[PDB]
Each structure stands twice: as structure tokens, then as C-alpha cells.
Ligand binder design. Structure first.
Ligand code: HEM
Ligand SMILES: CCOC(=O)c1cc2cc(-c3ccncc3)ccc2[nH]1
Ligand SMILES: [Br-]
Ligand SMILES: [Br-]
Ligand SMILES: [Br-]
Ligand SMILES: [Br-]
Length: 397
């Protein structure tokens, strides 16, 4: 009955395997919780949904990180301006455009598995989970394969900034990474304005809504939002979700014998892993919210992992169950800002997992999860490393 002594802006909290016990106390005793520094956080599924449904009170226009200002990106915007920006960028994310990527994503999955399959061991994080989303989003943005690692480095630097209160040295690194991304992207824009192709910048250049188009400034900001979504999130559901399949081998075995269970497995991997641990909302007025007094101008976190483990919604939430129905998890949020990339992320998860199951059918963890660390970060986090072993096989291509 004593509250957990926690700092919800500290990345070390999210790397602890005790975070879920802290969330459990919040949900049972103070659903809109204030941490040791007074930062407010919605911990229950009900409170998160209710805040998501009230964007005029719980605004994104102060920025979605604690103690960082808004950027001119759709995720830091409110309607009506947000709705126009999202409609413009949606040209890249129509259901048909995303579903048509299936063969190309599958090819990348097979190339990555081909690189390890003869060895009998790999680091699942380094060799499969991190590179696959990077290659997909890189290919959309025109990145040469041998330059993916450079983009991944810029992205890891940007997410480090989003995930902490950086030193001056890490602030400078962040500004350098943006400057390099800006240069590359404005070069792509200029090339595609002169010679359109069918890549993401081409589709976004030509997108038009209510007589409006995206400016070059907006194209840089929106493709940067997409890059980071495309290379810093899905990786952690691939690793951590596969980790749960290997820890609970009855679950691995169900999927291997029935491919039609894969869609529900991907949803359970998303629920469990919740790579995005929080998004902030700024209060536009003083308000009494699920029992807690909130003040105009402060930021409240939405705790999506906590909501995904709320017993009021998910029976036995600490049981990983690929068959779980319903599974209305909040890994992608809810409402006006619901992840634009959700279909792409689900497709990448599906195509890689189906190939892991079939091509590495006896996959096992080298050492159990108790020695596998999570990355300290207050925004997006998952496994650092996941050594796995399997019976070798020959490549496909
Ligand atoms: C498992 C992978 C991913 C997770 C967990 C995730 C999570 C989220 C969350 C939580 C939000 C905010 C929702 C809210 O506050 O209610 C969001 C927004 C967004 N995501 Fe993702 N994301 C993922 C992958 C991606 C990818 C792959 C892309 C693009 C290729 C992407 C693009 C976006 C965009 C553009 C927004 C802003 C939408 C808006 O503000 O209207 N995301 N995502
Ligand atoms: C340091 C400047 O900031 C950015 O470069 C930035 C990128 C970015 C991406 C997300 C995101 C994207 C898609 N899906 C979930 C989250 C959120 C905040 C972000 N900030
Ligand atoms: Br706005
Ligand atoms: Br579809
Ligand atoms: Br594209
Ligand atoms: Br069954």
C-alpha cells in the first residue's frame, strides 16, 4: 500500500522488469498517478482511452515528449490542422499501397534469414529484428543498402534524444543527425519533383487535399516522423514477441501447426511488447480526471504498456496467449493520432514471423530472459540483444 518510488521520465524505469509491478499499484490505487517528481500519468485502460477521446482538453500541440517542445510534425498537431496534414501524408499509407509491399518485404526477410541460416546461431535483435524494418523504410525513402547503417545511426541518436533529457553533447549529436537527414531528404525531394518515381517522396510530393500540398519543409518533417516509426518501433515487437513464443513453447508449437493463428499472434506480440511506452498530452484547462486534479499547461503521460496489462480489460494479462480474443490493445494508441503506420508494422511482423517459424523451426534462446536486458529509454524500448540457436539450413537465394 505504499506507492512505488518511480520517475516516469527516467529511462531506467522502463528497463526494469519491475515496471509492471509499479503499474499494477497505480491501476489499483491511483489510476491517474503522480510520480516522485509530480509528473502525471494515466495508468488504466479507461483513463488512457478517456484522455485520447478528449483531444481538446488533452492536446498534442505541446509536443508528445515530457520537457521537449512541439515540432511542426503531424504528431504534435491538433485538429483541424492535424487532419489536413494526416490526409496529405495518408497518400503513402493507403491500404492498397501498403498491402502491395508484401512481396518486397518478404524478399527482405528471406535475404536476412539467408545471411544467418547456415550458421546455427544469430543475435535475433541485430540480425533480424532491427534490420528488417530499416530495410523496408530505407527502400521507401531511396536509401542505398550500404547506407542503411548510417540512417539507423542517425535514427538511434534521434530516439536517444526523445527518450531522455540529453547532455549538451547529445543535443549537438541530435542536431547534427537532423542536419544530415535534412540534406539527404531535400536532395530526394528535388530529384523526385523533376523525375517522379513511385517511392514515398514521390507519392507525398504529388499528394493534394482541399487544394493544398506539402511544402518542402513539411516533407522533411513528415518523412522524419515516418523514418523513426519505420526503424525504431517494430524491431522491439519482433524481438520481444518472438522471445515470448520461445519462452512459452506451447505457443510456438501452436503457430507452427496452424498458420491461420498468425494474425492473433501478432496482436498478442504487440500487446505484450508495447514498444512506445508513453505519449504526452498537454492540459488545455484545469480538470478533475479520474480522481486526480490536473492543471492547465502540465503534461500527462499515456502509459500504453500499463493499459495493455490492465486486468479490467485483459483477463490474466501476464499470460501470453496468441489466441487472445478480444485483444483491443493500445500499442498503436487510439483516436485522432492512432498510428498511421500500423498496417505496415503488422505486415512486417507477419512476414518475418511466418518465415522465422518455417525456416528456423527449432529456434531456441541461448540464455533465458532473466539475463537479457532492455534498453534504458523513456519513450521507445525493447531488448538490446537476443542470442538464439537453431539447426542450420541452406539459403533460398
Ligand atoms: C510496432 C510499431 C509501431 C508502434 C508501436 C507505433 C506506435 C505509435 C503510437 C503510440 C502513436 C501515437 C498514437 C496515440 O498517441 O494515440 C503513433 C503515431 C504515428 N505513427 Fe506509429 N508506431 C509504430 C510504427 C510506425 C510505422 C512503421 C510508421 C510509418 C512507417 C509509423 C507512423 C506513425 C505516424 C505518422 C504517426 C502519427 C499519426 C498522427 O499523429 O495522426 N508508426 N505510432
Ligand atoms: C528529435 C526530433 O524528433 C523527431 O525526429 C521525432 C521522430 C519521431 C517519431 C515518432 C513516432 C513515429 C511513428 N510511430 C510512433 C512514434 C514519435 C516522435 C518523434 N520525434
Ligand atoms: Br496544431
Ligand atoms: Br489489405
Ligand atoms: Br513508398
Ligand atoms: Br486450440
Amino acid at each position: 500500500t505504499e506507492a512505488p518510488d518511480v520517475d516516469l521520465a527516467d529511462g531506467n524505469f522502463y528497463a526494469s522488469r519491475e515496471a509492471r509491478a509499479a503499474y499494477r499499484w497505480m491501476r489499483a490505487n491511483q489510476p491517474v498517478f503522480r510520480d516522485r517528481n509530480g509528473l502525471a500519468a494515466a495508468s488504466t485502460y479507461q483513463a488512457v482511452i478517456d484522455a485520447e477521446r478528449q483531444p481538446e482538453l488533452f492536446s498534442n500541440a505541446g509536443g508528445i515528449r515530457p520537457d521537449q517542445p512541439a515540432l511542426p510534425m503531424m504528431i504534435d498537431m491538433d485538429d483541424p490542422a492535424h487532419l489536413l496534414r494526416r490526409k496529405l501524408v495518408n497518400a503513402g499509407f493507403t491500404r492498397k499501397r501498403v498491402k502491395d509491399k508484401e512481396a518486397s518485404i518478404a524478399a527482405l526477410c528471406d535475404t536476412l534469414i539467408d545471411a544467418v541460416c547456415e550458421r546455427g546461431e544469430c543475435d535475433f535483435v541485430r540480425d533480424l529484428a532491427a534490420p528488417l524494418p530499416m530495410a523496408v523504410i530505407g527502400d521507401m525513402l531511396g536509401v542505398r543498402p550500404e547506407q542503411r547503417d548510417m540512417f539507423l545511426r542517425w535514427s538511434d541518436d534521434l530516439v536517444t534524444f526523445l527518450s531522455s533529457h540529453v547532455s549538451q553533447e547529445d543535443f549537438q549529436i541530435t542536431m547534427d543527425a537532423f542536419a544530415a537527414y535534412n540534406d539527404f531528404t531535400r536532395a530526394t525531394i528535388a530529384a523526385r519533383r523533376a523525375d517522379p518515381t513511385d517511392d514515398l517522396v514521390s507519392v507525398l510530393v504529388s499528394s493534394e487535399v482541399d487544394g493544398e500540398r506539402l511544402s518542402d519543409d513539411e516533407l522533411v518533417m513528415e518523412t522524419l516522423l515516418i523514418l523513426i516509426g519505420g526503424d525504431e518501433t517494430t524491431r522491439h515487437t519482433l524481438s520481444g514477441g518472438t522471445e515470448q513464443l520461445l519462452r512459452n513453447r506451447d505457443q510456438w508449437d501452436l503457430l507452427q501447426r496452424d498458420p491461420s493463428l498468425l494474425p492473433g499472434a501478432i496482436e498478442e506480440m504487440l500487446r505484450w511488447t508495447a514498444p512506445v511506452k508513453n505519449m504526452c498530452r498537454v492540459l488545455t484547462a484545469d480538470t478533475e480526471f479520474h480522481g486526480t486534479a490536473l492543471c492547465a499547461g502540465e503534461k500527462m503521460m499515456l502509459l500504453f504498456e500499463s493499459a495493455n496489462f490492465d486486468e479490467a480489460v485483459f483477463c490474466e494479462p501476464e499470460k501470453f496467449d496468441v489466441q487472445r480474443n478480444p485483444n483491443s490493445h493500445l500499442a498503436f494508441g487510439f483516436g485522432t493520432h492512432f498510428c498511421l503506420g500500423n498496417q505496415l508494422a503488422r505486415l512486417e511482423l507477419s512476414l518475418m514471423t511466418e518465415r522465422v517459424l518455417r525456416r528456423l523451426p527449432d529456434l531456441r534462446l541461448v540464455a533465458d530472459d532473466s539475463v537479457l536486458p532492455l534498453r534504458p529509454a523513456n519513450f521507445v524500448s525493447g531488448l538490446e540483444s537476443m542470442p538464439v540457436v537453431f539447426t542450420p539450413s541452406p539459403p533460398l537465394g
